[PDB]
Amino acid sequence: ISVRGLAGVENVTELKKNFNRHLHFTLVKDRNVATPRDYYFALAHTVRDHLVGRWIRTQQHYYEKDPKRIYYLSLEFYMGRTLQNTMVNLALENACDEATYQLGLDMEELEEIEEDAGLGNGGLGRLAACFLDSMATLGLAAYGYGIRYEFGIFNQKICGGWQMEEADDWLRYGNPWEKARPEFTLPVHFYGRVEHTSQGAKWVDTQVVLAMPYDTPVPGYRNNVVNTMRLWSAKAPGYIQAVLDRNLAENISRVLYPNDNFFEGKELRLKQEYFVVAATLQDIIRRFKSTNFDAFPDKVAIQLNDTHPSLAIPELMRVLVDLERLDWDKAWEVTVKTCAYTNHTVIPEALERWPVHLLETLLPRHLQIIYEINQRFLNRVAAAFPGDVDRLRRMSLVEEGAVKRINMAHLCIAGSHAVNGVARIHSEILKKTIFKDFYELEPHKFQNKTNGITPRRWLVLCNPGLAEIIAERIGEEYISDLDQLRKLLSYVDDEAFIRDVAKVKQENKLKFAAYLEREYKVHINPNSLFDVQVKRIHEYKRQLLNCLHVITLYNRIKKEPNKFVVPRTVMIGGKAAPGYHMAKMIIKLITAIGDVVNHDPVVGDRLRVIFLENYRVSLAEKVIPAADLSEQISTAGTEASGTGNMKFMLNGALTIGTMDGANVEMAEEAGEENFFIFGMRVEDVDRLDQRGYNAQEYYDRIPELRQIIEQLSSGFFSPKQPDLFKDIVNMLMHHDRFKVFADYEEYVKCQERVSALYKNPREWTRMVIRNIATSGKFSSDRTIAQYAREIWGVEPSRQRLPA
């Protein structure tokens, strides 16, 4: 593939030399005992050496130039593997391929050794990872700041058809990409109390946890820019027990909480949040110092990814008032201009509302600062809406009830000059529902920043053949300017391009089928429509609606066995938060459907249903490029944006989905006729809520649906334990918040239209080309350019740094 670059003779010679050098001196191995793992490590170290000069030069350039610095604070960075990504952005892929081939090795085999850096749960974590890449590609002096969890998202095993969790020991064989920086270790304080003297308040008698930073390089695409991701690791500041007890402090960075769109008020999580925020803000203040605080917002932007790091607002006030001696007003003007907040969901149980008692014990000074912030904000509300007493109760940072709580989203809005949603429909709903009172007070604060994905990882890395047939016609500029994909609409009637698109897809399906056979020993039919739903397991995403369709296909086949149907391989994958019973029961239903469907001789290879184990970033890179049909079927109004939808669109799959999140903009970009939109719109969901959702009405009017519920309830998909899915049935019939049954009919009819088009490969491929060609808006470069110009106040750039 030409998009993989040049294999220069001197460069290849040097790479082999450095490979062998690292094998010897760094690994203390030799070719008689080296394993594939040893060879992956020698290549990783060789490749990492190419980033070092660039990394030092970039950081020096930012110091000499003094641009405004962007601090992206997130509790999650779902980075995935780094070896291939580094090669792609430095243009070393073909050279390393050749160098390793000349040494008798297979570079793709080596790449499979690397563990995903799985420091995220799903969407929000991966968005942060795409954003880091785009900010480096756009020449921004941007710093990703988070926590170096020892254990990322658990490794999911399927045992007896059920999810089992295993600790993800991602650091076992080391992380060659990071650089430990113990010399820059800082102190983070907890508990203690406030003394109010004549020098104001003083936070004393605290317990200290040290924050040790680990820096990882983040290379831009061919611009020689190398930015930094700084991740903090927790360290302790009779005798035997006192040494063993150091683990209590070190437990702060031990493991990522594995929830997705769900708030659990755990004190340990609150410590993780504050730990990231306190250490990051000391870095920020020190770098700034190296007259002053007036210009702080001109040199600093702090971006809050969700409310997770919202303690930065009170922490910045604490530092500016208590330690730097600024008056409250000047400090508050600074804080608001520095900070901006990104909201990721309207689902109520996702919102962070910490008990005030907890904040009072753990962070007494922050709680004091929060109450003063609230009092002053509520005084502005009263002056703007005099006599509107309910508004004050609704807008307050303090929530009433048996347990008083602090609404972290309300703190974020009060302390930020910009608040944004992650898709047009979501940003509008914030202004019209959830944050309507805030929007009326300060209309100008409310923005939209439709999410995006990086086309480096999500096209060049994961689908080289696709990237190559595109580059054959329009060159390589589209890799860092994805709106150039629009040029591909010129080839909708081009017989060579139609042939190559379909061939690339078939090669990817063969590559995916080989991976499943080899690694999980699962056999799938390559000449079947690959129907894929990969994302976290949650009732709102409606994996259960997919299950109803799948069973509908099986039941229709059994009713009329001689009738031809487009062969399908239905694949569903994703993790369930440990402790989310319904999510865990859904995984077991998927595997149980497959237990019946996949062994029925009448069905044979016409229909197969498989649960894809351990869905994670590296699996996404394998399965998405192989998919024919992309399932994005959340109840309208529930998926804020989605980003997996975008990946599928860029990789040649057609989409079946509701008008929700960024699906609406994707369908707008491609033309609605080039998408498979079905189901209730947000207005219909609301009308049902207004009159009351009665699932029984659907069961009574739909014979096919009725048949499926009776099989589930009667034990057809669980012969040895007939009442096993009694809980799934109960929720669907009586407490279904996401209205699965209401979209059943239209979803099945829509799926029939999907099959009808798939029977005409030429026309399926032509509609694919119209999707790939209009996928340009969904690049994270576009998104990041919008944050930079509309929020951060910095101009993005593609100009290269000296080679």
Place this chain on the structure above:
Amino acid sequence: ISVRGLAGVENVTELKKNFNRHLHFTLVKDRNVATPRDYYFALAHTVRDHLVGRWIRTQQHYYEKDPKRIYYLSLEFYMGRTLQNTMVNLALENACDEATYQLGLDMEELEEIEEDAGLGNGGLGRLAACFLDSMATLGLAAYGYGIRYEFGIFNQKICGGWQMEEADDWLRYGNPWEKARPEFTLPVHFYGRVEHTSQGAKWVDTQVVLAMPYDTPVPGYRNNVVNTMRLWSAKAPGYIQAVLDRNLAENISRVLYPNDNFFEGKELRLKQEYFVVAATLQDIIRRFKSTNFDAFPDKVAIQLNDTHPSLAIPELMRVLVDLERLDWDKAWEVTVKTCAYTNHTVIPEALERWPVHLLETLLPRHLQIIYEINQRFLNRVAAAFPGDVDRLRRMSLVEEGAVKRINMAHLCIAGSHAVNGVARIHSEILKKTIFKDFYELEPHKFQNKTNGITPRRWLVLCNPGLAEIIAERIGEEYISDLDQLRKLLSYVDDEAFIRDVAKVKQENKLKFAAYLEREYKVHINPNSLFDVQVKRIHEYKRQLLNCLHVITLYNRIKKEPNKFVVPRTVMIGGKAAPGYHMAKMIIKLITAIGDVVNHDPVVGDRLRVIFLENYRVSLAEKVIPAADLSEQISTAGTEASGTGNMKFMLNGALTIGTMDGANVEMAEEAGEENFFIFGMRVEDVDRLDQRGYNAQEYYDRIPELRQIIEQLSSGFFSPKQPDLFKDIVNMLMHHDRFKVFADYEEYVKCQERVSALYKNPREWTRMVIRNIATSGKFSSDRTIAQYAREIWGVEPSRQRLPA
């Protein structure tokens, strides 16, 4: 100094290149932000690269040659710093000095950054470290095996005159010398139960702890041999708590137990012991396999450093019988021929006697194997001494009482073909008292291996000037053949040599005084006799007898202020085990004596008493070369050998001590007239024990002693808390096991003779030369050659490996 080698032009050029390369690529630093710490690390990495080829070649040579392999099992390796040692043994010291000087840096300043690898308590730990060095210098295929504690011996701080302990975070900035080997991680089992089937016993339902090895290179002196030290680190094999609970398994290698000559039956310690033994023996069996077991003792020697790893005996039987299917008898013949045990003390509270209940819970199969071992050994005792029923009770591996226990020393003797003491007087006492019943049963098993110290670390590294004036007269061969020091008796009347010895000592005293002023801000008089007692704090070592002398000097000065006395700086240092009350009270007495003595204007600079903080291997390298008088005053019969005594002797100090441990052999080597021997001999200690030690008789007959006890009891050395030393006084007067008062008179008189000779510098220096010259026997090369030929069955060699 010529003993530091050549600074070749190409070598210096290469070293600078590699320094700068590591600074850039390994450290990701540059000269504008680099600190001394960064420069130490770049030099450490540069130096480590020189060991790598040698290390790979040595291990390959052992594989090709197939010599018998020596496994040295120890719970402690007190290695100290490694940078200077590596340079010395590879002949790179002058070249690196020049290379760093040419880069504008001071190499000795860089060396001070390195943390001691303090994985030992004192003598036994450091012996293991000297032994590793000597085994590499003697070309033996020797493997040091132990545990990689995260925290070594605590860092001692002195606060208000008392010891405070701080965790020794020796790995904070990393360990550049070790190589993690996670690929060779092995499983260690605990608890569970035994199933007795038809395939014999089966240890099932166990809990697993993983043992991850870290390999460190151990370079021989200029022979290009690089051996390995393998240290095991412990790793774990609702959801959140299960991940946080991984620390319970990882706590096994967290911290070294800080006891010295004291047994505490802690279950965690028992796990540490078994963890080292089980993982090491799997390595041993695997390497052996790569007909067979008959030759196992011809290819394997397992050396047990104390009874700490004595579980290797039952573990080897367990593996050979239960897993390899050997019959008990063949397995037991193998085990006895493989294993040998070194005893380090006769002090009763040092002996390991584990509760059988504990062994039964934790290691059920080992306990079963132990009882069968005992039954068979006791059958041999009965057949050899028919009707001697008390002998059976005394020799048994099982000790009776409220809590039945397993005597680990009895297991070691029963399962070893050789048992040795660590000094001639100690090995004889084993045969005559403690192990007399065992000696009568198997006389041939009992040996002596007088301890030694490596003259690389303890002469070339720590006293380059001394090593140089010696090499000026007899060349460099003595560095790996210390008996050549005997050639120095030719210079006892040589005016140039007498001058240079005394000048080297004065330079070392000035260097030590500068270190104390700079680092601890303590001022000492350089023209004072440096009287030093450095070793762990324990009643048997009699720091308290030194305290009585010191107070005697002060009281004599005050009685006759105009009388001239040889000026002295009395320095005492050493750690107290946390929890040993008397040891901790002794440290506070030393500091309290200094509080009065050091501020008395009548005394002025004629007498100074200082407590040296944080005595450790790197401090030993600084203070020992500066000492004039070496205090080795343990009650006769209590110090098995000692090794600090040897260090002092090699470095130009004269010794004041009892006829105990290796002091007897040192005095024998130098001629008793060249030593300051005083006090009770072992026979006198016994006669006192026979009639009963009455400390009151000494108090009543000695007016000067009486004066000191009355000052202590009355509060003279603790004005603000007059009864503070009431406990020290009580023990001395009524429960003194070590009879301090009995040696008081002779010790003071002996000290007067020390002063009388010090007033004649020419004659002091001549007696020093007679000590240095006869210090050759105490090289650890001699000791290791004796283990190799008399126990291991391997011939030591100085032949070089290819350059």
